[PDB]
């Protein structure tokens, strides 16, 4: 039985699994008032990928395919391809193309295109509204609003690189993005399918532990806090190791290598999320060189030392 | 250095219309939204609406979609709010604010008073019995009055109360003792001795 | 629209005590924000996104809650923290504030110094008559004044006024004025203002003839 | 501890010189020019070299506060480290970790969040790594943007790379040059603490390159981007830290559908791969093929022709 | 997807200036550079320069700086190259080309001839014999190139040789052979079709036995 | 400037042969590109970035090289490939081409078909008289024509012309023209055209007498 373990990496050395940006800090908070069900950064401890989770960090919230537009519009419809530029399969038992955004918001990025005619290139500012009725990646279609009405060609490889999130600056619509609200992956009047399950602390006094990054904002006052259940490196590491789970709960200690002192302990659940013993919203204060260490498998009656 | 400076206090008759100015300095005026907030003494804080200067886009609170109008002239970096058909229930403190995520920038406030009362000088009466003396400021409009004794500790000046379209106020002094009462609106100054 | 209900409406604490005030919402919100306001000042954004501190905000402050129940907390009260706090929301248009919570200081109890003043001869010249009663430098704020004109309670023509908490000794003061007509005033002899406070089980009485 | 390389197909892995996925394998002659990239540099026992760091998303990013050059849409960025604490120029590395290790013009987005009240903004931005004012080792880089009024001073600012540009003409169609290092301290200075240049030493051998196509934002740039090791291999060696038992590790590229070996190659201790082939050649590989470490060999092992 | 159409053949006296047109269709004109290339019989290909139409941007080969001028009419999607002070070494085929990375789009080419010689129409002489028969046409004493020679209006294409002309004394001389079955000739009329664009002249000479 | 030296300048290949032509640069370049051009048509980008194939280019073509030495290769020559190939460079302005490599096709040897023609009567009613000789459809290209005016060889007044390789049967043809005055022409009787080719050890002679 191959022994289980987590990578020796500091928080800042790791990557958010829900947007291609580095981790910044750890956060814990109450989560009973809403549904926590992200589809990226979902992986079991024995290396089973869930939801829309794939291995590469750079591919989260990216799109590839060819685009079309009606005459003189700045809106382009992208017919999605799989990222290796082969055909996309809508029937495959997944919620949406692997790496698809798993929150409702406006993502701003750049739409680049290289034409096979002579190799010429071009890129323009583009925005995708993931809460739009016309956002249906599971059906293989998304729509971008851009800065051109003439420059992109049909039947040519086009890619979308995400940059950040936007907001109109006002107070009337200052509730976006909503990181815990999944899009309708197939468009209006449909239900999502093959979702990774929602998570919640069941043990009394416990809250989820979130790995937090700050999304860049390109305008106004967006919700830039972005929390994921596992760092992308853990997803990658579990997929590689595939160590059998000896129990439903793995005990992690967060250690400071400068002193060897344990700062806090936490539970890593088999299905792939972390909880701590704490009540209230809290930005954890951690030393620069700290990292997580797996110490043992425990039963389900283990009470964490308060954080 | 971001600062919102508002227009001065206004005293308007019922049925009239007033325009409050909000002059923004320290940033690109047309880049941020302006919020307008109403504060009545017993009604807490209320959000009137917001506007993005230089554009036509405005969002009004439904309660105010007929009383408040937002305009702007970008030349002078000033945002204006106009209130129509004033009643006694519009007497409040009005703010303009640039409301952000982590911090705000609020104007100093513009005081609006709606009343038909004529500007009236106060009648000042002496109050005579460690002994406590007093000063009675009765029947003036509008507020404020300034009450002093040179001697400051210990002195209690109580908030004035409105009785029949006229304000009445009280002052305590604890120890020649002379009451100094000033009413800026009426350009009046009085002195009252002890007996 | 979303209605914000704060509790308690008024509360007091000694320096060093723990303070907690709550906000309950008619509907679910995603974040709750808090404002601080002092007399004569504009509102200042104090806490944002439920738990995050604004610039210049001391670490003794914190916020927590979710859904429809939120709270603001000071683990050790200080004098500078005495102010009014409003909760505020963005999740549903229109933007709304709470009614507010007034935070005052606790202090050793202090008896009111009661003073009564007959109408001036100058006021009688002409028509008016105000009988004034001063209740100065007492604690707590809760106090009741009753007017008695030679035996019977008089309730009509009474106007009261309270100062805010004194910034020097954390006491309150109060003014009570019975306003009558000139012909009404000289039909009686003894005027008394009775004040019932916690500092004594017998009302503090001051009169004149 | 046994040495090994990850069970990952090529398409599942990431280029280590630009935040984009790998696409294919390429081999070619490299005696006519100097091969010395500073990103994707790692020894087999997990020691990072050059400007190489672990996260793929940080490659070709810049962080710091910006100042504005008057009478231009250009900004000077005073660099900070990735966690926004101060950057130390005295630290013995060629440049901040993740700094671009090629000469070309990179297009991306300059975003900023102001600490005054939290408002945000972003603008199209371009950095020229061949610029005289491109001096990352000194903690300064220069961006060309589409605004001259919008960014504020002393506020966290980030540059997100997207792709590379070229002016469209033939006169300057020689950019980017992926095998030409920038002058990390600005024009006419010498780089320091560089990871060494690599070359096949065994007769008949060529480097094996891990190739991606960079997004182009304009004109006809050079978009082929080759790295010596996949970012994941860097990540894996760092984690594993298996001691090298020899100077050369023999890898076989295997097709699991059939169990047959497609070709073999050398993975050198210093962190690069060579194959036995002569000439430019785009490798044809099965979709699920992967690399397998089979044994340590000496320096005199003759590879089976690829 | 792109097509470049160039202006017609030019014949100029020395010292003059010529302006060659290149009309682009199929893309946004002001978005791509146009390259200009010169081709002389014994000198391979030579790059004159490039320009980005509607903008001031031009890059000249130093050898042509002062000789070639690039201008554009963006309304009409046309790029122009002007050559000044023409001499005989400017006699060449001139191309406009949109040169990309993986493919190009070239104009059909514009032939320029610089000469002081007077334009002369061709004299066309029949070549007849004194189971296949070879006939001919002798096109003598014309200027300048080219002439267009066809047989029976283009009907006879196979077994047809038109030889490169030879320059003798400011005048070109050319011959063309055509082969048809003997069993047939002369029961068919076989006619030489000679056209000379410079003279705006086309003449026909049938072929007849002796 | 970067001078590109191609080699060989001209060559021939049998269908199926392995063909290799080289490009040498005066200085180092980062990529070499190749063009194909056939007679009467514009150049087409054939190979780009040294080894990558352009659109329509058959898999039998390939390119290689680095620094200052490059090559283009056809693993199996086909008739379709007969053309002229130019290499091309971007690394330094100005853009430059090589002089080119002319690739022609090989074929079974073939004897010249010789035809001789007396002067036309319309030309005879003019000062001149031109005697034409056609040497058609032969292989290889190497051939010599000799004129004999009543016995002795005449060399003055002869103009020759050779065609390029025929795209149909891959043969060459040649024209020889003896131009005299009417009075010079009417001073002799028998004009003969002798052709010596590799296909025979005896010269092919065709003559006429008046």
Query: What CATH number is given for A60-173 in this structure?
Result: 2.40.30.120
Among E206, E187, E3, residue whose Cα is nearest residue E98: E3
Of the three residues C57, C88, C107, the one that is the final residue of a domain is C107
Among A213, A297, A289, residue whose Cα is nearest residue A8: A289
Among B125, B158, B126, residue whose Cα is nearest residue B143: B158
Q: Are residues E71 and E33 in the same domain?
A: yes
Q: Are B171 and B158 in contact (CB under 8 A)?
A: yes
Note the residue count of chain B.
195
- 3-class secondary structure for chain F? CCCEEEECCEEEECCCCCEEEEEEECCCCCCEEEEEECCCCCCEEEEECCCEECCCCCCCEEEEEECCEEEEEECCCCHHHCEEEEEEECCCCCCEECCCEEEEECCCCECCEEEEECCCHHHHCCCEEEEEEEEEEEECCCEEEEEEECCEECCCCEEEEECCCCCCCCCEEEEEEEEEEHHHHCCCCEEEEEEEECCCCCCEEEEEEC
Q: Are residues B170 and B107 in the same domain?
A: no
Q: Are residues E184 and E103 in the same domain?
A: no
Query: What CATH number does the domain containing F47 carry?
Result: 2.60.40.10
Q: Are residues F93 and F145 in the same domain?
A: no
Which chains contact E through at least 3 pairs of Cβ atoms less than 8 Å apart?
A: A, D, F
Q: How far is CA D59 from CA A83, C104, D98, in A?
A: 20, 54, 4
Check if A174 contacts C (Cβ < 8 Å): yes
Among E20, E45, E199, residue whose Cα is nearest residue E112: E20
Q: Are residues E80 and E182 in the same domain?
A: no
**Around F140, how many Cα atoms within 13 Å sit in the side-chain half-sphere?**
9
Provide the Cα torsion B91, B97, B100, B103; round to 10°: -90
Pairing of strands E10-12, E110-114: parallel
Q: Are D255 and D27 in contact (CB under 8 A)?
A: no
Of the three residues E85, E116, E147, the one that is the final residue of a domain is E116
Of D118, D149, D150, the CB nearest to B100: D118
Q: How far is CA C208 from CA C88, C116, C135, in A?
A: 51, 8, 16
Q: How far is CA A303 from CA A205, A278, D157, in A?
A: 9, 12, 43
The structural domain count of chain C equals: 2
Angle at CA B119, nearest 5°, toward B115 and B123?
120
D231-240 helix and A232-241 helix, angle to the nearest 10 degrees:
70
Give the best residue of B102, B104, B106 to mutate against chain D (max D CB count within 10 A): B102
Alpha carbons A100 and D80: distance in angstroms, whole number: 31
Provide the Cα torsion C90, C93, C94, C95; round to 10°: 0
- Using an 8 Å CB-CB cutoff, list chain A residues near C63: 281
Q: Are residues B7 and B56 in the same domain?
A: yes
Which three-class secondary structure state does DSSP give residue A216? coil
Q: How far is CA C60 from CA C63, C74, C76, in A?
A: 10, 5, 7
Q: Per the CB < 8 Å rule, is E47 touching F132?
A: no
Among C20, D39, D109, residue whose Cα is nearest residue A166: D109
Q: Are F101 and F11 in contact (CB under 8 A)?
A: yes
Note the residue count of chain E.
210
- 3-class secondary structure for E11-40? EECCCCCEEEEEEEECCCHHHCCEEEEEEC
Q: Are residues F46 and F92 in the same domain?
A: yes
Q: Are A39 and A102 in contact (CB under 8 A)?
A: yes
Chains A and E touch (3+ CB pairs under 8 A): yes
Q: Are A65 and A80 in contact (CB under 8 A)?
A: yes
Check if A127 contacts D (Cβ < 8 Å): no
Alpha carbons C50 and A280: distance in angstroms, whole number: 10
Q: Are residues E111 and E188 in the same domain?
A: no
Q: Are E156 and E181 in contact (CB under 8 A)?
A: no
Q: Per the CB < 8 Å rule, is A159 touching D218?
A: no
**Chain A nearest C-alpha distance from B9 (Å):** 27
Alpha carbons A199 and F95: distance in angstroms, whole number: 63
Alpha carbons C64 and C47: distance in angstroms, whole number: 10
Q: Per the CB < 8 Å rule, is B102 touching D117?
A: yes
Among B191, B183, B50, residue whose Cα is nearest residue B119: B183
Domain A1-59+174-307 has CATH 2.40.510.10: yes
- Using an 8 Å CB-CB cutoff, list chain F residues near E58: none
Could you tell me the fold of the domain covering D1-58+173-306? Nucleoplasmin-like/VP (viral coat and capsid proteins) (2.40.510)
Among E56, E64, E59, E48, residue whose Cα is nearest residue E96: E48
Alpha carbons B185 and B188: distance in angstroms, whole number: 8
Q: What are the residue ranges of CATH 2.40.30.120 in chain D?
A: 59-172
Q: Are residues E11 and E48 in the same domain?
A: yes
Alpha carbons B76 and C107: distance in angstroms, whole number: 51
Q: How far apart are the first and last CA of chain A?
A: 32
Experimental approach was: X-ray
Q: Are residues B83 and B136 in the same domain?
A: no
Cis ω on the peptide bond leading into residue A24 (within 30° of 0)? Answer: no
Q: Per the CB < 8 Å rule, is A172 touching B50?
A: yes
**Token pair recorded at residue B31:** 């880049």
Which three-class secondary structure state does DSSP give residue D188? coil
Could you tell me the fold of the domain covering D59-172? Elongation Factor Tu (Ef-tu); domain 3 (2.40.30)
Q: Are residues F5 and F102 in the same domain?
A: yes
The structural domain count of chain B equals: 2
Which three-class secondary structure state does DSSP give residue A234? helix
Query: What CATH number does the domain containing E158 carry?
Result: 2.60.40.10
Q: How far is CA F164 from CA C55, C181, E163, in A?
A: 86, 132, 9
Cβ-count burial of E157 within 10 angstroms (0-12 exposed, 13-18 middle, 19+ buried)?
A: exposed
This structure's resolution (angstroms)?
A: 2.8
**Token pair recorded at residue B163:** 């009785």
Chain F residues with CB within 8 Å of chain D CB: 28, 30, 49-51, 63-68, 90-95
Among D114, D127, D124, D122, residue whose Cα is nearest residue D76: D127
b/e per residue, C20-33, with b = 16+ CB within 10 A?
ebbbbbeeebbbbb
Q: Are residues B95 and B2 in the same domain?
A: yes
Chains E and C touch (3+ CB pairs under 8 A): no
Q: What are residue A49's DSSP bridge partners?
A: A43
Q: Are residues B121 and B104 in the same domain?
A: no
Of A12, A58, A221, the CB nearest to D82: A12
Alpha carbons B180 and D50: distance in angstroms, whole number: 80
Q: What are residue F63's DSSP bridge partners?
A: F72
Q: Are C194 and C146 in contact (CB under 8 A)?
A: yes
**Token pair recorded at residue D143:** 């961006």
Which three-class secondary structure state does DSSP give residue B76? helix
**3-state helix, strand and coil shares in percent for chain C, rounded to the nearest 5:** 5, 55, 40
How many angstroms from the chain centroid is the CA of residue F130?
A: 25
**Token pair recorded at residue B8:** 């001065």
Which three-class secondary structure state does DSSP give residue A256? strand
Query: Taking CA atoms, what residue in C is nearest to A180?
Result: C30
Q: How far is CA E197 from CA B19, E115, E144, in A?
A: 83, 16, 9
Q: Please report the residues numbered 174 through 203 in chain E whose beta carbons come closer than 8 angstroms to any beta carbon of chain A.
A: none
- Using an 8 Å CB-CB cutoff, list chain D residues near A177: none
Sheet holding C152-154, edge to edge: C152-154, C144-149, C191-196, C204-208
Q: Are residues C119 and C77 in the same domain?
A: no
């009111």: which residue's tokens? C112
Alpha carbons D90 and D67: distance in angstroms, whole number: 23
Q: Are residues C53 and C114 in the same domain?
A: no
**Chain D nearest C-alpha distance from A147 (Å):** 12
Check if D218 contacts A (Cβ < 8 Å): yes
Alpha carbons B186 and F110: distance in angstroms, whole number: 128
The residue ranges of DSSP E strands in chain A, in sequence order, are 25-29, 63-68, 75-80, 106-114, 121-129, 141-146, 158-166, 206-214, 217-220, 225-228, 249-256, 261-269, 273-277, 282-283, 291-298
- Using an 8 Å CB-CB cutoff, list chain D residues near A59: 21
Of the three residues E116, E142, E175, the one that is the final residue of a domain is E116
Pairing of strands B10-12, B110-114: parallel
Q: Are E139 and E176 in contact (CB under 8 A)?
A: yes
- 3-class secondary structure for chain E? CCEEEECCCEEECCCCCEEEEEEEECCCHHHCCEEEEEECCCCCEEEEEEECCCCCCEEECHHHECCEEEEEEHHHCEEEEEECCCCHHHCEEEEEEEECCCCEEECCCEEEEECCCCCECCEEEEECCCCEEEEEEEEEEEECCCCEEEEHHHCECCCEEECCCEECCCCEEEEEEEEEECCCCCCCCCEEEEEEHHHCEEEEEECCCC
Cis ω on the peptide bond leading into residue E144 (within 30° of 0)? Answer: yes
Among C77, C55, C74, C73, residue whose Cα is nearest residue C64: C73
Q: Are residues C118 and C190 in the same domain?
A: yes
Q: Are E192 and E175 in contact (CB under 8 A)?
A: no
Residue C193, C-beta contacts closer than 8 angstroms, at least 6 positions apart: C114, C116, C131, C133, C145, C146, C147, C148, C176, C178, C205, C206, C207
Alpha carbons B80 and B110: distance in angstroms, whole number: 12
Alpha carbons F41 and F39: distance in angstroms, whole number: 6
Alpha carbons E3 and E25: distance in angstroms, whole number: 6
Q: How far is CA A181 from CA A176, C205, E106, in A?
A: 10, 66, 54
Among E44, E41, E94, residue whose Cα is nearest residue E67: E94
Alpha carbons D43 and D50: distance in angstroms, whole number: 11
Q: Are residues E51 and E86 in the same domain?
A: yes
| CA dihedral over F83, F87, F90, F92, signed as positive or negative | negative
Say how many C-beta atoms besides its own lie within 10 A of residue E208's C-beta.
11
Alpha carbons D35 and E65: distance in angstroms, whole number: 38
Among C44, A95, D97, E79, residue whose Cα is nearest residue B100: C44
- 3-class secondary structure for D213-270? ECCEEEECCCCEEEECCCHHHHHHHHHHCCCCCCCEEEEEEECCCCCCEEEEEEEECC
Longest dimension (CA), chain F: 69
Q: Are residues C47 and C118 in the same domain?
A: no
Among D80, D113, D97, residue whose Cα is nearest residue A164: D113
Alpha carbons D83 and D167: distance in angstroms, whole number: 35
Q: How far is CA A255 from CA A67, C156, D136, F45, in A?
A: 49, 73, 33, 62
Q: Are residues F112 and F100 in the same domain?
A: no
Of the three residues E75, E91, E116, the one that is the final residue of a domain is E116
Alpha carbons B158 and E74: distance in angstroms, whole number: 80
b/e per residue, A5-40, with b = 16+ CB within 10 A?
ebbebbbbbbbbbbbbbbbbbbbbbbbeebebbbbb
Alpha carbons C29 and F165: distance in angstroms, whole number: 85
Which chains contact B through at least 3 pairs of Cβ atoms less than 8 Å apart?
A: A, C, D
Q: Are D42 and D236 in contact (CB under 8 A)?
A: no
Alpha carbons C48 and D233: distance in angstroms, whole number: 43
Q: Which domain does B124 fall in, by range? A: 117-194
**Token pair recorded at residue D28:** 């070619």
Q: Which domain does F207 fall in, by range? A: 108-210
Of the three residues C74, C91, C107, the one that is the final residue of a domain is C107
Of the three residues C107, C122, C144, the one that is the final residue of a domain is C107
Residue B71: phi and psi, rounded to 5, are: -135, 170
Q: Are residues E111 and E138 in the same domain?
A: no
Q: Per the CB < 8 Å rule, is E101 touching A150?
A: no
Sheet holding E148-151, edge to edge: E148-151, E191-196, E201-206
Alpha carbons D166 and D104: distance in angstroms, whole number: 9
Q: Per the CB < 8 Å rule, is D32 touching F67?
A: yes
Residue E29: phi and psi, rounded to 5, are: -55, -45
Structural element, H or E, at residue C73: strand C61-74
Q: Are residues F159 and F148 in the same domain?
A: yes
**Chain C nearest C-alpha distance from A32 (Å):** 8
Q: How far is CA C4 from CA C1, C10, D9, in A?
A: 10, 16, 56
Residue A144, C-beta contacts closer than 8 angstroms, at least 6 positions apart: A67, A75, A76, A78, A111, A126, A127, A128, A160
Q: Are residues F38 and F21 in the same domain?
A: yes
């Amino acid at each position: 039985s191959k022994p289980f373990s987590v990578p020796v990496l500091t928080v800042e050395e790791m990557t958010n699994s829900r947007f291609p940006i580095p981790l910044e800090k750890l956060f814990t908070g109450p989560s009973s008032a809403f549904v926590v069900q992200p589809q990226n950064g979902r992986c079991t401890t024995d290396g089973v990928l869930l939801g829309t989770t794939q291995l590469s960090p750079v591919n989260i919230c990216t799109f590839r395919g060819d685009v079309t537009h009606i005459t003189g519009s700045r809106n382009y419809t992208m017919n999605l391809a799989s990222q290796n530029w082969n055909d996309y399969d809508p029937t495959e038992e997944i919620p949406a193309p692997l790496g698809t955004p798993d929150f409702v918001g406006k993502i701003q990025g750049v739409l680049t295109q290289t034409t096979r005619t002579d190799g010429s290139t071009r890129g323009h500012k583009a925005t995708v509204y993931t809460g739009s009725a016309d956002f249906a990646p599971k059906l293989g279609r998304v729509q971008f609003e851009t800065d051109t009405d003439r420059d992109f060609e049909a039947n040519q490889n086009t890619k979308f690189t995400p940059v950040g999130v936007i907001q109109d600056g006002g107070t009337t619509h200052r509730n976006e993005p909503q990181q815990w609200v999944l899009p309708s992956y197939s468009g209006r009047n449909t239900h999502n399918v093959h979702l990774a399950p929602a998570v919640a602390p069941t043990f009394p006094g416990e809250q989820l532990l979130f790995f937090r990054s700050t999304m860049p904002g390109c305008s106004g006052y967006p919700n830039m806090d972005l929390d994921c259940l596992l760092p992308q490196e853990w997803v990658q590491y579990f997929y590689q190791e595939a160590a059998p789970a000896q129990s439903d709960v793995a005990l992690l200690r967060f250690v400071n290598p400068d002193t060897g002192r344990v700062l806090f302990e936490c539970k890593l659940h088999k299905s792939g999320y972390v909880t701590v013993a704490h009540t209230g919203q809290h930005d954890l204060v951690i030393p620069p060189n700290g990292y997580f260490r797996f110490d043992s498998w425990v039963n389900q009656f283990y009470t964490l030392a308060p954080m | 250095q971001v600062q919102l400076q508002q227009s001065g206090a206004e005293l308007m008759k019922p049925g009239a219309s007033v325009k409050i100015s909000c002059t923004a300095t320290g940033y690109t005026f047309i880049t941020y939204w302006i919020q307008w907030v109403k504060q009545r003494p017993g009604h807490g804080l209320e959000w009137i609406g917001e506007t993005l200067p230089g554009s036509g886009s405005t969002n009004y609170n439904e309660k105010f979609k007929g009383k408040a109008t937002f305009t702007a002239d970008t030349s002078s970096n000033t945002a204006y709010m106009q209130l129509s058909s004033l009643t006694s229930e519009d007497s409040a403190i009005y703010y303009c604010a640039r409301i952000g995520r982590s911090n705000d920038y609020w104007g100093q406030g513009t005081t609006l008073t709606v009343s038909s009362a004529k500007t009236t000088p106060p009648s000042v009466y002496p109050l005579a019995p460690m002994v406590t003396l007093g000063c009675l400021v009765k029947g003036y409009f509008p507020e404020p009055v300034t009450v002093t004794w040179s001697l400051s500790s210990g002195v209690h000046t109580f908030p004035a109360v409105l009785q029949s379209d006229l304000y009445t106020l009280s002052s305590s002094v604890t120890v020649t003792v002379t009451c100094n009462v000033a009413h800026p609106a009426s350009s009046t100054k009085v002195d009252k001795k002890i007996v | 629209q979303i209605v914000l209900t704060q509790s308690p409406t008024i509360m007091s604490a000694s320096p060093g005590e723990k303070v907690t005030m709550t906000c309950s919402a008619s509907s679910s919100v995603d974040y709750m924000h808090w404002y601080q306001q002092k007399s004569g000042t504009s509102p200042k954004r104090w806490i944002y996104d439920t738990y995050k501190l604004a610039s210049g905000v001391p670490a003794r402050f914190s916020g927590s809650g979710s859904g429809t129940s939120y709270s603001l907390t000071i683990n050790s009260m200080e004098a500078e923290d005495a102010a009014t706090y409003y909760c505020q929301q963005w999740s549903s248009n229109p933007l709304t504030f709470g009614a507010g919570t007034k935070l005052e200081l606790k202090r050793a109890d202090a008896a009111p110094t009661v003073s009564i003043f007959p109408p001036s001869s100058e006021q009688l010249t002409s028509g008016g008559a105000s009988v004034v009663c001063f209740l100065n430098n007492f604690y707590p704020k809760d106090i009741n004044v009753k007017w008695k004109i030679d035996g019977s309670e008089r309730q009509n023509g009474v106007l009261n006024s309270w100062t805010d908490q004194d910034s020097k000794d954390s006491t309150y003061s109060m003014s009570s004025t019975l306003t009558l007509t000139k012909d009404e005033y000289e039909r009686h002899n003894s005027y008394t203002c009775e004040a019932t406070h916690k500092t004594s089980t017998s009302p503090i009485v001051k009169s004149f003839n």
